[PDB]
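Q: What does the assembled structure look like for these inputs?
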Amino acid sequence: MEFQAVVMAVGGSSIPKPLLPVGNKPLIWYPLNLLERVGFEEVIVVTTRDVQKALCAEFKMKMKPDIVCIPDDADMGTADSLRYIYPKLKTDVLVLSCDLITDVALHEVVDLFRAYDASLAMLMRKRDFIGVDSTGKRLLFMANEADLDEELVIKGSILQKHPRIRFHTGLVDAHLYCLKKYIVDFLMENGSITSIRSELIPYLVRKQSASSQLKSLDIYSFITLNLAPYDACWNACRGDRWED
Amino acid sequence: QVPTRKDYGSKVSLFSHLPQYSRQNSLTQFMSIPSSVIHPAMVRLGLQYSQGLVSGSNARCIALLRALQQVIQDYTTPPNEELSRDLVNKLKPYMSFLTQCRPLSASMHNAIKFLNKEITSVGSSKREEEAKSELRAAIDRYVQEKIVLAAQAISRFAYQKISNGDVILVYGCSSLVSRILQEAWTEGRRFRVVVVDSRPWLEGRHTLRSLVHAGVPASYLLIPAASYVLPEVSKVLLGAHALLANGSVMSRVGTAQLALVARAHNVPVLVCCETYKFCERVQTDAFVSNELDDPDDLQCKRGEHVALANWQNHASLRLLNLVYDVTPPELVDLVITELGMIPCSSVPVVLRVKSSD
Amino acid sequence: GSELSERIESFVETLKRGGGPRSSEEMARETLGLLRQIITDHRWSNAGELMELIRREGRRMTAAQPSETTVGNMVRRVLKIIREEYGRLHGHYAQLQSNIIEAINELLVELEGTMENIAAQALEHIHSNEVIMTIGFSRTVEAFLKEAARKRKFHVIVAECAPFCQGHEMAVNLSKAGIETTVMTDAAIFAVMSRVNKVIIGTKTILANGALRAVTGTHTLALAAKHHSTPLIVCAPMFKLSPQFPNEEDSFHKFVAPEEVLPFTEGDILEKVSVHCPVFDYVPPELITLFISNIGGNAPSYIYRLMSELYHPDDHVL
Amino acid sequence: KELIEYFKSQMKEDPDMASAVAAIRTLLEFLKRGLRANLTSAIETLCGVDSSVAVSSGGELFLRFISKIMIERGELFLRRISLSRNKIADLCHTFIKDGATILTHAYSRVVLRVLEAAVAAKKRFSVYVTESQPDLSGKKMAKALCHLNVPVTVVLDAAVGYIMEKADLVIVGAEGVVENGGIINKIGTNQMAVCAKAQNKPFYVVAESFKFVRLFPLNQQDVPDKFKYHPWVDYTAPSLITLLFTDLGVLTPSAVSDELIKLYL
Amino acid sequence: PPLQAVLVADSFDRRFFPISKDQPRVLLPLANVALIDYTLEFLTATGVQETFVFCCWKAAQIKEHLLKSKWCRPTSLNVVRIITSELYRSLGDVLRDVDAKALVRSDFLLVYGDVISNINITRALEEHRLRRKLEKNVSVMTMIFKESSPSHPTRCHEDNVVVAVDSTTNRVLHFQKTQGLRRFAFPLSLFQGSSDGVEVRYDLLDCHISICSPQVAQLFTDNFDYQTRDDFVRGLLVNNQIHMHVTAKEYGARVSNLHMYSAVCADVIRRWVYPLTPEANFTDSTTQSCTHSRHNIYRGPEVSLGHGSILEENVLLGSGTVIGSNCFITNSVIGPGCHIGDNVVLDQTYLWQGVRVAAGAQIHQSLLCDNAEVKERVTLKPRSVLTSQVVVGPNITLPEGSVISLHPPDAEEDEDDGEFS
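A:
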């Protein structure tokens, strides 16, 4: 068992994500298809309760051969869902969500996780400014414009160890993650962090006790420009698209 | 199941029997994300072999033995079956997958041979976890002594040869020769090193950084400047990847060439190789068994006029970058092992006295 | 006067800065043009005054680029031509000048058909299904190969000269003609030398011993070819033949910037390293089997006779 | 110093006796008097007189072979060293053809033993002896071979390239053999081996088993300075050497390294 | 059109004290060649037909130096124009004196008088002309840089600069110096101004060969407070756009302090600024020809190396240099006409013309100026400076930071002797 994939059921004002978002077919069947094509004989599914505990009837219609469904609370996040199923996971966690229309062959982000011995591997596709290396595999800086009083600040040591950093603007997170065991161990030891999208910024590779294994941990990201993922920001190419 | 990777490009007519792949595509495009047929540590090892992240001859063996420890730790015993047969039958597709990723070095071949000999000699009365602990302790003792004690012995045996005031020439990237140079500089020898590098790997920059960080005065140049500087060079250190039955030196492709030019300038060459990297296999040329690198690696950017960009459209154009060659045994003087200073003709002697005979 | 000194200064700074022009035959044609332009627009009473003038104008071109011996030994050939004209008229103002004009015109007629004669006699050295190995980039050797492949089917190993990969252009220009070429590096020379049947290389300057300088790494190819006993074919014209002895004068090799070997973005280790990039090398005459010029094939034990027939011993200092 | 006195008494009483044999006999005589091993260690730390390679080589091999059976161990070791030379002659003298032209370096009892074993087997041959003059010892070799009733010619030192084309084989006794198959000998061995290799003549080395030293010189300077002293000592490459003639058999130069790996210094 | 250039022969930053108060900074020799000759050689190797030399402070010495050079000959392709005025005291004052006199026509080269480079500007020139023909004269400046390293010994912290650029149309968005700043704040309007793919660049060595237009001179005329170039580029990027060219195989840098001086002279001796090598004799003088040996050993005419002298790495010896016996010189530059004693060492030092070194001296990483003299048993520590014939007394060990001159207030001593003050 190399991975144990977890499907999240939260959001994050256009349309409701778990049940109502049916573009051409049911939305929840596609991440279970992503799992059940390339292996994943063991599936655990988190159910939504922000729709007043009604998404379990929509999640029990995919008819996968092996599923683990859990009840959850209404006000809850991704990191609290990771802390809920912590004593029943024993290996790497590969996080998905319900509203996921992914045409990307997901073996390449797993290759980025495996080949460099990464602690985290995520998938994005062209608000959030992602500073990536000149190779295009290792992201170095990420922040939003809401929590930054000054516009954006960059340490000098990451300019010394990486002289050029490629920044992107129009990227969106596809929420296809690959977590190592000590990442969720640090999530258990620090229970103040919720909404794992907001956990990607305090990753602590740079100069600072929050690491378990210069000598540091590696985090990668793959930017796609061919296989169309789900997007609802501009919605110009999302409405005039085809679903195969 | 594990398929075969497609051969990339137009092969050399002399190298049609040897496979030539590309680092752009991977074999794990049609494999499961929870690795079931191949062990996950083994597919991690194949990914860090195929992408070129582990290039040293000792680093491949160390990462191989660590992945084998991860496989034996994640091993279970089926009913009415022996470990000493089932582990043999299961480790063979793992090494086949690793071979299809990248061709194996002879150090890794002897590691596979030693591990197969050890797991063959496991008694039937031993338990599951007890035999797992025996195999992990045997792998730990093996990598411990036959990396670091042999490295310290070869470092002392080369420290007692290098004098004061001489100049030393090196080629390629090898941790053993670099450790010899570092432990010779720290213990009191005052020398400078001429580093010879070659295209397209350019792995001389690694030992160049390792010699500048150690405080050694360094000189950096390539294959054509070696003919210019060998009248000033008095000593050549080399890093061997395999030693054969006739005394040949399998190393990087610029080794026998450099040894011939050094003998033409009367400069004695010195290879540094540990005894597990030997071979009962023998070859006399670089044509019957060799590794084929990327044909898209020979191209470079000299201005804005890259000529080998669209090399596949030319039907009469061939691209070749050899990895290994052999030396004739009359060109290489030293063979520095942990047993002492031996010539090239003593390699099957050391094979005999270390093969329980 | 003004245009004369202007074009002389332009040619001197062109040889000081870089390689201008790119072809050595084009530079030889510009050398003969410079010499006929400097003799047609000047005044002299004795021929020795013109000899001293050509010596004084050639010292500056020699000190401009000492690795470019083509302008120097072409000036020396023109000096011997004017000396032979003064000798045949000694045993004189306009007749000697017209003799110099027709002799330098005949020298251009002989120089335009050098590679043509090399390609004409190219057929008597290449057989079918043959493995050829070359180094660097030269128009003479690729013209040799593309004429020899008009009736014969064979193979060429285009080994790159790699301070800067110029042999890729030779490999592409041959593969456009269909010579069934193969591209490798400098580190696979002795590794492939056990399958190489002949070595066909060019050169930059033929020395007085029969020695030659060429694109760098070819001394290694000559040593590997002497080890594997293959004959070396040097397709070289008769204006790269110079009386400069190897150990007589300094500045043999031409050194360039170390950027092409080790780049500027390497880091802090560039302070404590010494990176030298010789783009040429020395090849002794005993490592050479045959020279191919436009008048016929000659031995390395025969370069001194061409030295006596083309050069005068009182001009070797220049 | 009684050890040097016993060494001089054992070496000067017989001028046809080697030095390393007398050194190992001095070590055994100290082992006759634990305290015997301490006295042997004291005299082998005190025997720094002879600058020959064979003396220190036999001392090191006896120091390994010693490590109440030490006296009998040295006894049969000296028995093997004393009976070595007859096996040397009997294994080496079978290669000399009739009417051959012998080339010989300076005086040593080993080449004299193999030439008297060769004339003992009814063979006729002429011997060219290089004079080898930092001191006139090749003249002493020619005098000791003229008493043997064999045709000998005193050859000038700078004529080994002159007479190489007529001497069909080159048999030279060495005084020290390094591990790869090369030899340490008197200074005129290197030029003779190079002229024999350029003239394709077989260069034979006739030395015993106690001269197996664990050294590896690459150049003419890499031999130790305590054995050099106008040098007295050169080095011959093992590629310049055809065969060796030890008491373990007629050996290729790659067999000395096998014996020293099996012996472990 | 003919290619012009504005040559600022006076850097108004006060850095070479008390070095510059005896001879100006464009006349300081790296290896027997003043910096003005390197700058004129780079400008005539670019293709510039006419330059404008602006000498203000010690302008008579600069004029007397460069009139006898090659670039004032009638056979020279690059004719120079000497313009001297004691009124201007700033870079923007130089460029508005260019705009007032109507000197340049179109697409001139803004360059300082101490720039060491071999970059072909003609690719940047044709890219700049193509952008001006496409965007119709809104391409204002093209800042040329070089690919470099963050830990490279040439670029210093007073010259390390970080910029954020548009990675598609190679134009500069942000400009700030890294002096004294461990963190760097980048504004948000940078990403909204250019959205074609943005990327920060820290590996750029500022060669200060930013080619520009006469509209730059118009903008310097319109704003009086634009003193120099960094104020101009920050005032234009805070408000007409400035582009960028990147050089990957050709060197370019100018001197700012003694660290920059030592680094760029070590780059000259190690042949990083080829074709401008000291043996090619680019400035036609009879007393600057050198012979290139192995390991970058340069030897001039009539040096006569003594017995036991060791020259191992990166040495240059001027014409008339007298070296004694048993010396050990490496990574050093020796001027013409020097007197070197016995049993001395020179490690990464720079000794100019006319010096005299006695026996037993220990000089390391120092700068000995013209007509200097050092006595016996004197041990110089690294970064020690002595200018214009300072005599340092015997048996005196100078400290690490010790700048000594005949001028009292700028140095640690005065016109008295070095033995007793």
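Chains E and D do not touch (no CB pair under 8 Å).
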